[model samples]
Target: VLSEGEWQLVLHVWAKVEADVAGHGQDILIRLFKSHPETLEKFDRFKHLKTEAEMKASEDLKKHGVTVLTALGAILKKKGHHEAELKPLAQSHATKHKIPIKYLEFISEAIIHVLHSRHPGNFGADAQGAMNKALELFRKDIAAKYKELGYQG
Candidate 1:
């Protein structure tokens, strides 16, 4: 649901921030858990990580984080053209993984926070609106699939 104009911002931000995917992913996950410490319980690997430093050291967290950030990137590739590709992942989280919809938003929000902080000028109102719309769509579908599995929001 992003306008064509928003592609540059999204692409550039990803390019700039993800030069080192491991580090960027680590930052996103670390920031997410730090922002909402309770959400750390969702990860099986969290038992081994009491702090962000531990998370950084864990290759699993980096890979997992890359998975999420990669999904977020899918939408930006052609301005939501690949949004459907995210549905299977969402459904898996809903039915198999049972990752609550709320934590999904938490991670998304944490990613947004990082993107905003990483780029002060390029991440402007237009970029915000586009990303928000994308997140909204992603959130809606995830929530719908979650409820479809007979789970409560």
Candidate 2:
């Protein structure tokens, strides 16, 4: 659970990033793929995109990024009560889509990177720390959901 002060920073920074969700989402994916090339192989639409230019111009990637950020937004809106937004998504990944739980953190790393880069002035250490705690819970619940579904990973 976030302290009220932490929640305030999280939502404040999140609100600042709202309008650019699409762009930021795509950037997050771009950052993730660059840091872990193997992750790019997971996205059918984006796997073949070999260049940064191809990635930036990918509408599919952009939309998927929107979905990712939207999910995070929903979780934040509920103040980290993540079941509604994250459970089904986690289940699908475990049973159908299939990605290791470890890779999940890489995506969060990308998100933190992008948010800080975009709001360097406001997303200061305190705010970043708050978001980190929020995302920690976010990932933990998803991992729990995976365990509930008997996922091996």
Candidate 3:
């Protein structure tokens, strides 16, 4: 299990990635875990492992998430240079996730709530700033990942 601080970081990163990429972010995250299966151990809350069937089901969801993200990244990298392609990918991700297009705002609120609940004393300007920085870094990392995969767009 992640410590409170680690959980904070996880939530922050998840929220950030979700915000930046919306459903595609989730997809990418799914892929990230699939590509590196060990990453699943990091997120105990998201894990579903009671019976064998349950474990398989959970793994299936994880696989779906990864597959979508990998496809999205590949598509985006190849066609992202165009505004049309970019907008649709973003829009589709939001629609699929049943989230408003303003995912970043939603994620920001979620992070704030988690921080307030887990570390009340740390929920101040410094923490917010740190989160902002973390989000920025995550965004860059995502972009880099696409680039590494030969995403031209």
Candidate 4:
């Protein structure tokens, strides 16, 4: 989904976040829910928490946030080519979770937003371009599964 240079750039940026994936991951979720509160309704685990402070301090949120970032770290290791990794995730989200595809788009933006905000000097235009291009492909791959499962939204 990315050129060699783009892949390298993304990996380089990713390395900086790997030391504290959970921290960055939680921040991404906070950014997402803060920006798009409606999407929070999809999460049965933490949806009951109405405030940012409540969401931030929830252990469930932390665990799930770590899970999310760890999964993305694995996919980045494959440079976004791991259908074996993504297919089931897409299927579950489409069929069981009923999460709107738009939320995936929102999460992608949230990821870049958190990264850029956390590491301003490292996440400049070039890094943002690479991440945007990479995540756009990630969203498309999941969208393909959603479409195949007749999950329209």
Candidate 5:
């Protein structure tokens, strides 16, 4: 749980880069696929792209990217309390996508990367710590449910 001060600070840092959410989200997706090609296999449209350029050119990329960012945007609304807000979606991903914990961690990494790159010095160690801690809650919930769903890892 974040203190009121920490929560506000995190949101303030996020605000610095909120304007670029759309483009940044797409870049994060691209980075995910590039870093872990296996993850692209989950996307039927992306799996066959063969090249990063082809993947970027596809219109589907934008929509998928939007979906991800929109979901993340919704979750970001719940400041200082994520358990109740994230329960449903976390369980759903555990049951449906069955994505590995590593993939989920990658999402946090990409988000922080985008935040750091976009805001540069605006994202300080404290802000970075808050982001990391908040994302840990997300991962913690999902991982708990996922383990219940037989995720030994």
Candidate 6:
């Protein structure tokens, strides 16, 4: 289990993404600062970094975070969280950030590539299935979050 501070950080990160996707970046950033004042510096740096460089630098962290987040979201989705509420979140964010939906697939591929590179002996069907499942759940949650925020299409 993560320490309370770590868990809070994780939750804050999720909330940040949620707020941003929902067009509530200002409010989210405010709340983030309230919870994690030190993160502001890193956040500012992240905003100015090129997307590709940011992704590269944060690849490991992103993969680990997304793996856990996706698993949790899968559970949430199965427990009656509306799929209608998820798809638009992803689509809206993608549109707003100029991130092609294909980038989602690319990220998934990047995660698997990293796993393969790190654990050559463990790259098997089961590992691939887990990756796919996590990606599917993440995509759904992204869309649902947007939908709940009143995004259409």
Model 5 poorest 10 in a row by lDDT: 76-85
| Candidate 2, position 72, lDDT | 80
Models sorted by lDDT, best on top: 4, 2, 5, 1, 6, 3
Note the residue pairs that clash in candidate 3. Answer: 27-69, 30-66, 31-66
lDDT (tens digit, per residue) of candidate 2 on 22-107: 98888899999999898888777679998889999988889998998887898898887667878788888898878887788888
RMSD of each: 2.2, 1.1, 13.8, 1.1, 2.1, 13.2
Candidate 4 scores a C-alpha RMSD against the true structure in Å of 1.1
Candidate 6 per-residue lDDT over residues 1-153, each given as its tens digit: 223443343343334344323222222233333344443344433444333444345544345345434544443334334455445445545456433334444445544554445444444555445545545666556655555555542
Over 4 Å off in model 6, which ranges? 1-100, 150-153
Every candidate's lDDT: 0.74, 0.87, 0.43, 0.87, 0.74, 0.44
Runs with alpha carbons beyond 4 Å of true place in candidate 1: none
1-153: candidate 4 lDDT, tens digit per residue? 589889888888899898898889889999999999988888888889888899889888988998999888888778877799998888888999998778898999899999998887768899899989888888888888889889995
- TM-score of each candidate? 0.84, 0.95, 0.29, 0.95, 0.84, 0.38
The sequence of per-residue lDDT tens digits that candidate 1 reaches over residues 1-153 is: 556666666676677666776677888889888998878876776755887678878888889878877776765675656547766876677666677778878888887887788776767777766676777777786677667667675
Which pairs clash in the backbone of model 2?
A: none
Worst 10 residues of 1 by lDDT: 74-83
TM-score of candidate 1 relative to the true fold: 0.84
Candidate 2 ranges with C-alpha deviation above 4 Å:
none
Higher-TM-score candidate of 4 and 6: 4
Q: What's the CA RMSD of model 6 in angstroms? A: 13.2
